[PDB]
Design a protein around this nucleic acid. Structure first.
Ligand code: FES
Ligand SMILES: [K+]
Ligand SMILES: [Mg+2]
Ligand SMILES: [Mg+2]
Ligand SMILES: [Mg+2]
Ligand SMILES: [Mg+2]
Ligand SMILES: [Mg+2]
Lengths: 72, 118, 45, 128, 137, 85, 48, 97, 74
RNA sequence: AAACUCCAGUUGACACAAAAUAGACUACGAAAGUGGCUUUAACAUAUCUGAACACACAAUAGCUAAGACCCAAACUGGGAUUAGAUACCCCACUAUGCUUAGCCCUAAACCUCAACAGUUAAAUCAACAAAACUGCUCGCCAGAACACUACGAGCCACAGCUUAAAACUCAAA
């Protein structure tokens, strides 16, 4: 899917966060899923730069308070 | 083409080493070489005893003469280095900087079973 | 049979690796014991 | 053979190559290059001398010219190394391929075939 | 201190000493372990022979020379003769894969000498001469 | 011609000559020198050497594959979770 | 660009005019090529 | 016909190939320090690729450079140069005890 | 073997039959000998698992094809 | 046992020989082949197929001539072993393996798979080997043995190689 690139980038930068996957919940929304949703929202706003939209989405989520520890 | 002469010279006093280097570069120029650069890797003990011109050496000075020369000259230069006495050893190679680094992307894996029949 | 032979070889290799490394035991590492044979039925070394 | 002072094929077209120092000219001449550069210069000379479109290489005439240059190289090599069976085979096979190409050119374009035979000094002899 | 199996490098000053002597000065016990014989010779750091022994010199003859006990006896005799000249510590340089390859060392230990280093100098030809054909037995 | 008492040299630790000899023998075996000498005692004809090398390579490949298979399958070597069925 | 770089480098080439000076400079010089590699792939430079 | 259908593209999660430690670096015969890292300290034997973990191209380059240095008086043949006994250990071999 | 109990219980509850044990050779092709000639073979066989424990196809599939018994299968 | 006892060990000097480890790599070449280093030259063909004989190659062994000769080594001599000779074993040593220039042109020269192009769908398919085939071309085979023979022809080959029968005989091979 198109969101696969965003997911790969997010998992490269941050990896598996402290919030584990509750695959038993069909309505579960992972941290990577939240990042993808915010990226899609910002893309709908008209922005096109992937490597800049990534940072903007990260900033928005940090403002929201989501933990975004980097891998290194 | 671009050649690199690795030259191990007899451990001598500085004026003698200067004279030997000047003589060798003069021979290279006579054979037609344009000497790009001259380097010195210092004087060090040889990795093994080397006998040359009825004399055994345990230490020597290392130099690298980068140059350009017509191909037909190289053989001649080798002969000259064979006849010199202050030269413990001398080898002319194609210059490594002329060998471009064709970048390897990685190690592609291969299944091990086929290796029995292949 | 061949599977048991490979298992014996693997046990021999594992025991040799344990002997060689110093992390298992300073005494065992200092002994430098070498194994002639390893055979599984219990295991005989 | 081309004069040793002849520039390499790539370096004869760059602008300002006539103003560089004599050392730079030597470093880009045939003197400081292997035999393959001389072969390339020879091939370019033959192309500009014989074929109507030297820019084209897939043409039969260009292939014949290149193979003739290779045949000359193999002959010069064997003149020194008489005991080289591999290059003897390569020379003979290249001569056979050139004969086949000349036969095809003669069957297709006879005027240009005559031009090839004159320029490269090749005499086309029918097989026994 | 941390023991390193690597020998001390000649020309570099190491703290290791034996009887107030450096590793470069310790006498050298050359051992040759052939299949039919074993020879032992102690020499000084200046290549001065001090003691020599072999299975044949110790009275063993023919096949009896190939036994490890013969090499042990040769080591005992060589160690005694060297110790008579003041040899205490030795550097063992063993070549060949004879039965006595180790036994000779034991003999030196039984002779009273102290081995501080074991060196293998087995002549391994980097594709040199052609060995004899395999025995048809 | 090389400097001596560097190659194939092991320092005896606290007079433990036997351990030092064992270490030296293990080093030579790891480097294959002992097998090299044993094979060089008599001439091995090139066809025989090629056959032996090919057989050794095939044996090593087969042994590695079998070890991998055994390690993979031994993960199921546990107590029966559905006894009585 | 290659030709221009070569022409610039020609200035530093050794000739019969500066032969002795270049020889003396090289004799005073000490070029090192030794450098190790880590398990991670880092070029460990020579200590001195 | 529908947006939810999968699209065709290269695996985005594909992790990069584990390049050999010397990949992208120029192996030279004069670099005795680098070459000695792949030889046996006690015998000077060149380690196989299963010990060095090097790719085929780099293994061949290292072997050729080692042979050239040995024959050209840059590197001891029967032993590793003692001056490099303390260099970083990159080969996967354990000898002592 | 994980679902053997559940499948047997479901079959018993629904009034139908279950066979989750080691399928003996000829339980279908040789049913007349193993049960008496008057035995009535199943009119439909439902495989919840079409592979045996060695990952080969269950022999019951081939046997039911031989005896012309339709097979529903997961 | 014979042999050697200017024999052996250490150190030093010291090759026209052979090319550990790398190589657990599977590369180059048409095949044979080719695994020390450097340098030079160099790895045919922008459609395929195309020869017992034309053209050019062709492991080992062998021949001719001149060198080299560490080691190995048919043959030979000696010592053992054997009832005994020979062989297996030990020792010494030669042709020979090496170089130069010619010749000989053989192999289980075998991936025992002709070259080129295409396919993985049917029936997958005698068996085994190595999954089954299709298109196209060249070469080859038509029971066994006689026969890698005889004769003829060709060859620097002269106890040779290539091509290669028939008669008698069998009901199998
Ligand atoms: S892994 Fe790429 S050069 Fe070795
Ligand atoms: K090898
Ligand atoms: Mg053809
Ligand atoms: Mg031949
Ligand atoms: Mg001879
Ligand atoms: Mg073959
Ligand atoms: Mg054909």
């Amino acid at each position: 899917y198109h969101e696969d690139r965003i997911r790969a980038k997010f998992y490269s930068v941050y990896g598996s966060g402290q919030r584990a996957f509750d695959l038993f919940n069909p309505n579960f929304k992972s941290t990577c899923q939240r990042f993808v949703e915010k990226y899609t929202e910002l893309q709908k706003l008209g922005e096109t730069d992937e490597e800049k939209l990534f940072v903007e989405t990260g900033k928005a989520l940090l403002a929201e308070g989501v933990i975004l520890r980097r891998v290194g | 083409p671009r050649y690199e002469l690795a030259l191990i010279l007899k451990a001598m006093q500085r004026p003698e080493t200067a004279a030997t280097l000047k003589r060798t570069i003069e021979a290279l120029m006579d054979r037609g070489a344009i000497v790009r650069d001259l380097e010195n890797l210092g004087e060090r003990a040889l990795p093994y005893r080397i006998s040359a011109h009825s004399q055994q050496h345990n230490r020597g000075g290392y130099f690298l003469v980068d140059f350009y020369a017509p191909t037909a000259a190289v053989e001649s230069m080798v002969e000259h280095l064979s006849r010199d006495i202050d030269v413990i050893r001398g080898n002319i190679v194609k210059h490594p900087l002329t060998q471009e680094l064709k970048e390897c992307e990685g190690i592609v894996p291969v299944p091990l079973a086929e290796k029995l029949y292949s | 049979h061949a599977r048991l032979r490979a298992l014996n070889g693997l046990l021999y290799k594992a025991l040799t690796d344990l002997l060689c490394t110093p992390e298992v035991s300073q005494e065992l590492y200092d002994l430098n014991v070498e194994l002639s044979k390893v055979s599984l039925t219990a295991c005989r070394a | 053979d081309p004069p040793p002072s002849t520039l390499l094929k790539d370096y004869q077209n760059v602008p300002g190559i006539e103003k560089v120092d004599d050392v730079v000219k030597r470093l880009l001449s045939l003197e400081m290059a292997n035999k393959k550069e001389m072969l390339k210069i020879k091939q370019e000379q033959f192309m500009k001398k014989i074929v109507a479109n030297p820019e084209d290489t897939r043409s039969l005439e260009a292939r014949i010219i290149a193979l003739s240059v290779k045949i000359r190289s193999y002959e010069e090599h064997l003149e020194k190394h008489r005991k080289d069976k591999a290059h003897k085979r390569y020379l003979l096979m290249s001569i056979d391929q050139r004969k086949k190409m000349l036969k095809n050119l003669r069957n297709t374009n006879y005027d240009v075939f005559e031009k090839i035979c004159w320029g490269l000094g090749i005499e086309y002899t029918f097989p026994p | 201190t941390k023991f390193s199996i690597y020998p001390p490098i000649p020309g570099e000053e190491s703290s290791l000493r034996w009887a107030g002597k450096k590793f470069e000065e310790i006498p050298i016990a050359h051992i040759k372990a052939s299949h039919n014989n074993t020879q032992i010779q102690v020499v000084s750091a200046s290549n001065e022979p001090l003691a020599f022994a072999s299975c044949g010199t110790e009275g063993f003859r023919n096949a009896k020379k190939g036994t490890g006990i013969a090499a042990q006896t040769a080591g005992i005799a060589a160690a005694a003769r060297a110790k008579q000249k003041g040899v205490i510590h030795i550097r063992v340089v063993v070549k060949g894969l004879g039965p006595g390859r180790l036994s000779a060392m034991h003999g030196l230990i039984m002779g009273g000498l102290e081995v501080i280093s074991i060196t293998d100098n087995t002549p391994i030809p980097h594709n040199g001469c052609r060995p004899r054909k395999a025995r048809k037995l | 011609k090389h400097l001596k008492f560097i190659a194939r040299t092991v320092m005896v630790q606290e007079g433990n000559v036997e351990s030092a000899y064992r270490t030296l023998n293990r080093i030579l075996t790891m480097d294959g020198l002992i097998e090299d000498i044993k094979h060089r005692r008599y001439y091995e004809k090139p066809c025989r050497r090629r056959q032996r090398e090919s057989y050794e390579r095939c044996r090593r490949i087969y042994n590695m594959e079998m070890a991998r298979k055994i390690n993979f399958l031994m993960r199921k070597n546990r107590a029966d979770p559905w006894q009585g069925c | 660009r290659e030709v221009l770089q070569l022409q610039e480098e020609v200035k530093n080439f050794i000739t019969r005019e500066n032969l002795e000076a270049r020889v003396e400079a090289a004799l005073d010089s000490r070029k090192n090529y030794n450098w190790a590699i880590t398990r991670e792939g880092l070029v460990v430079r020579p200590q001195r | 016909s529908n947006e939810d259908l999968p699209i065709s593209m290269e695996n985005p999660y594909k992790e990069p190939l584990k390049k050999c430690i010397l990949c992208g670096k120029h192996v030279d015969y004069k670099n005795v320090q680098l070459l000695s890292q792949f030889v046996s300290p006690f015998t000077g034997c060149i380690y196989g690729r299963h010990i060095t973990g090097l790719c085929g191209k780099k293994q061949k380059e290292i072997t050729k450079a080692i042979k050239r240095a040995q024959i050209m008086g840059f590197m001891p043949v029967t032993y590793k140069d003692p001056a490099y006994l303390k260099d970083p250990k990159v080969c996967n071999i354990r000898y002592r005890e | 073997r994980q679902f053997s109990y559940l499948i047997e219980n479901m079959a018993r509850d629904c009034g139908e039959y279950a066979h989750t044990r080691y399928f003996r050779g000829g339980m279908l092709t040789n049913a007349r000998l193993l049960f008496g000639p008057t035995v009535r073979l199943p009119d439909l066989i439902i495989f919840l698992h079409t592979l045996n424990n060695i990952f080969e196809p269950h022999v019951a599939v081939r046997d039911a094809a031989k005896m012309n018994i339709p097979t529903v299968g997961i």
